[PDB]
Amino acid sequence: LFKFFK
Amino acid sequence: LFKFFK
Amino acid sequence: LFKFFK
Amino acid sequence: LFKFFK
Amino acid sequence: LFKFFK
Amino acid sequence: LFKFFK
Amino acid sequence: LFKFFK
Amino acid sequence: LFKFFK
Amino acid sequence: LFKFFK
Amino acid sequence: LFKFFK
Amino acid sequence: LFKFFK
Amino acid sequence: LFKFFK
Amino acid sequence: LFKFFK
Amino acid sequence: LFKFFK
Amino acid sequence: LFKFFK
Amino acid sequence: LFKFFK
Amino acid sequence: LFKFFK
Amino acid sequence: LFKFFK
Amino acid sequence: LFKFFK
Amino acid sequence: LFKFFK
Amino acid sequence: LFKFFK
Amino acid sequence: LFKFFK
Amino acid sequence: LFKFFK
Amino acid sequence: LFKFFK
Amino acid sequence: LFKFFK
Amino acid sequence: LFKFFK
Amino acid sequence: LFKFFK
Amino acid sequence: LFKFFK
Amino acid sequence: LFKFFK
Amino acid sequence: LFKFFK
Amino acid sequence: LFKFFK
Amino acid sequence: LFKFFK
Amino acid sequence: LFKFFK
Amino acid sequence: LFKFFK
Amino acid sequence: LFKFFK
Amino acid sequence: LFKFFK
Amino acid sequence: LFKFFK
Amino acid sequence: LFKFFK
Amino acid sequence: LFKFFK
Amino acid sequence: LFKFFK
Amino acid sequence: LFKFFK
Amino acid sequence: LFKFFK
Amino acid sequence: LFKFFK
Amino acid sequence: LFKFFK
Amino acid sequence: LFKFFK
Amino acid sequence: LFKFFK
Amino acid sequence: LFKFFK
Amino acid sequence: LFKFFK
Amino acid sequence: LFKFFK
Amino acid sequence: LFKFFK
Amino acid sequence: LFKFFK
Amino acid sequence: LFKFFK
Amino acid sequence: LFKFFK
Amino acid sequence: LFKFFK
Ligand SMILES: [Cl-]
Ligand SMILES: [Cl-]
Ligand SMILES: [Cl-]
Ligand SMILES: [Cl-]
Ligand SMILES: [Cl-]
Ligand SMILES: [Cl-]
Ligand SMILES: [Cl-]
Ligand SMILES: [Cl-]
Ligand SMILES: [Cl-]
Ligand SMILES: [Cl-]
Ligand SMILES: [Cl-]
Ligand SMILES: [Cl-]
Ligand SMILES: [Cl-]
Ligand SMILES: [Cl-]
Ligand SMILES: [Cl-]
Ligand SMILES: [Cl-]
Ligand SMILES: [Cl-]
Ligand SMILES: [Cl-]
Ligand SMILES: [Cl-]
Ligand SMILES: [Cl-]
Ligand SMILES: [Cl-]
Ligand SMILES: [Cl-]
Ligand SMILES: [Cl-]
Ligand SMILES: [Cl-]
Ligand SMILES: [Cl-]
Ligand SMILES: [Cl-]
Ligand SMILES: [Cl-]
Ligand SMILES: [Cl-]
Ligand SMILES: [Cl-]
Ligand SMILES: [Cl-]
Ligand SMILES: [Cl-]
Ligand SMILES: [Cl-]
Ligand SMILES: [Cl-]
Ligand SMILES: [Cl-]
Ligand SMILES: [Cl-]
Ligand SMILES: [Cl-]
Ligand SMILES: [Cl-]
Ligand SMILES: [Cl-]
Ligand SMILES: [Cl-]
Ligand SMILES: [Cl-]
Ligand SMILES: [Cl-]
Ligand SMILES: [Cl-]
Ligand SMILES: [Cl-]
Ligand SMILES: [Cl-]
Ligand SMILES: [Cl-]
Ligand SMILES: [Cl-]
Ligand SMILES: [Cl-]
Ligand SMILES: [Cl-]
Ligand SMILES: [Cl-]
Ligand SMILES: [Cl-]
Ligand SMILES: [Cl-]
Ligand SMILES: [Cl-]
Ligand SMILES: [Cl-]
């Protein structure tokens, strides 16, 4: 799993 | 699964 | 499945 | 597990 | 385990 | 175990 | 065990 | 055991 | 045992 | 109820 | 009820 | 209830 | 209750 | 209760 | 109760 | 009770 | 009770 | 009771 | 009075 | 009075 | 009065 | 009066 | 009166 | 009156 | 009156 | 009156 | 009156 | 003079 | 003079 | 003169 | 003159 | 003149 | 003249 | 003139 | 003139 | 003139 | 030369 | 030359 | 030359 | 030359 | 030459 | 030459 | 030459 | 030459 | 030459 | 190949 | 290859 | 390779 | 290799 | 190799 | 090798 | 080798 | 070898 | 060898 948030 | 949101 | 929305 | 936050 | 905080 | 604090 | 404090 | 204090 | 105090 | 707006 | 507007 | 706003 | 704001 | 602020 | 501030 | 301040 | 100050 | 001061 | 424009 | 603009 | 701007 | 700014 | 700034 | 600054 | 400074 | 300085 | 200095 | 464009 | 742009 | 930009 | 920037 | 910077 | 810096 | 430094 | 240093 | 040193 | 696009 | 993009 | 970006 | 970045 | 960084 | 660092 | 360090 | 150290 | 030490 | 979409 | 997205 | 993201 | 992050 | 972090 | 930390 | 610590 | 401590 | 202590 990969999550990216900005 | 891939999701992209902006 | 592919969905694109703008 | 890797988490990065700034 | 490694944790870094600043 | 290693801990560093400043 | 090693501890350093200043 | 070694202790140093100043 | 060694102790030093000043 | 569901509402979506953009 | 369903409404769609664009 | 769920609300999302950006 | 959960609230998230950025 | 949990609150986080930065 | 736990509080952390920096 | 525990308090830490620096 | 324990207090430490420097 | 124990007190230490320097 | 109601006005709607898009 | 209510006004909404996006 | 309420105003919201983003 | 309440004002919030970020 | 309450003011908060960061 | 209370003021806090860091 | 109470003042604290570090 | 109480004053403390270090 | 009490004064302490070191 | 008034001009409006969208 | 007034100008508005988004 | 007033200017606002975001 | 007033200027505000963030 | 007043200037504030952070 | 007043200047404050931290 | 007053100057304070720490 | 007053000067204080520690 | 007064001078104090330790 | 002038070009405008939206 | 002038270019503007948003 | 002038360039502005946000 | 002038450059500004934040 | 002048450089400022924070 | 002048340099300032904190 | 002048140097200051703390 | 002048040097000061504490 | 002058030297002072304590 | 060139593609443009808005 | 060049890609641009906003 | 060059990548730019904001 | 050069990487810049803020 | 050069690394800079703040 | 050079390392600097504060 | 040179090391400096305060 | 040189060592200095205070 | 030289040693100095106070
Ligand atoms: Cl990515
Ligand atoms: Cl993509
Ligand atoms: Cl597509
Ligand atoms: Cl990373
Ligand atoms: Cl690291
Ligand atoms: Cl380390
Ligand atoms: Cl060490
Ligand atoms: Cl030692
Ligand atoms: Cl010894
Ligand atoms: Cl939907
Ligand atoms: Cl969602
Ligand atoms: Cl979330
Ligand atoms: Cl969290
Ligand atoms: Cl924690
Ligand atoms: Cl702790
Ligand atoms: Cl302790
Ligand atoms: Cl002890
Ligand atoms: Cl309608
Ligand atoms: Cl509405
Ligand atoms: Cl709202
Ligand atoms: Cl709010
Ligand atoms: Cl608050
Ligand atoms: Cl508080
Ligand atoms: Cl306190
Ligand atoms: Cl006290
Ligand atoms: Cl006492
Ligand atoms: Cl109109
Ligand atoms: Cl308007
Ligand atoms: Cl406005
Ligand atoms: Cl304002
Ligand atoms: Cl202010
Ligand atoms: Cl102030
Ligand atoms: Cl003061
Ligand atoms: Cl004083
Ligand atoms: Cl005195
Ligand atoms: Cl035009
Ligand atoms: Cl323009
Ligand atoms: Cl401009
Ligand atoms: Cl500027
Ligand atoms: Cl400046
Ligand atoms: Cl300066
Ligand atoms: Cl100085
Ligand atoms: Cl001096
Ligand atoms: Cl002297
Ligand atoms: Cl084109
Ligand atoms: Cl382009
Ligand atoms: Cl670029
Ligand atoms: Cl760069
Ligand atoms: Cl650099
Ligand atoms: Cl350096
Ligand atoms: Cl040095
Ligand atoms: Cl030396
Ligand atoms: Cl000597």
DSSP string for chain BA: ------
Contacting subunits of L (3+ beta carbon pairs below 8 A): none
Return the residue matching tokens 């205070």: BA6
Experimental method: X-ray
Q: What is the resolution of this structure in A?
A: 1.5
Rounded Cα–Cα distance for residues AB4 and AC2 (Å): 12
Contacting subunits of M (3+ beta carbon pairs below 8 A): none
What is the distance in A from the centroid of ligand 3 to the CA of AT3? 11
What is the distance in A from the centroid of ligand 12 to the CA of V5? 22
Task: Please report the sign of the dihedral spanned by the C-alpha atoms of residue V1, residue V2, residue W1, residue W5.
Answer: negative
The four Cα atoms P5, Q4, R1, R2 give a dihedral, to 10 degrees, of 180
Tell me the DSSP string of AI1-6. ------
Output the CA–CA distances (angstroms, integers) from residue AE5 to P5, AF5, AI5, AV3, in the order listed. Answer: 34, 10, 39, 28
| Residue AR1, helix vs strand vs coil | coil
F1: enclosing H helix or E strand: none
- Spell M1-6 as b/e; 16+ CB within 10 A means b: eeeeee
What is the distance in A from the centroid of ligand 43 to the CA of V2? 51
**Which of AU2, AM1, A2, AT4 has the alpha carbon at shortest distance from AV4?**
AU2
What is the distance in A from the centroid of ligand 22 to the CA of B5? 31
- Spell AE1-6 as b/e; 16+ CB within 10 A means b: eeeeee
What is the distance in A from the centroid of ligand 38 to the CA of AW5? 25
Rounded Cα–Cα distance for residues G3 and Q4 (Å): 16
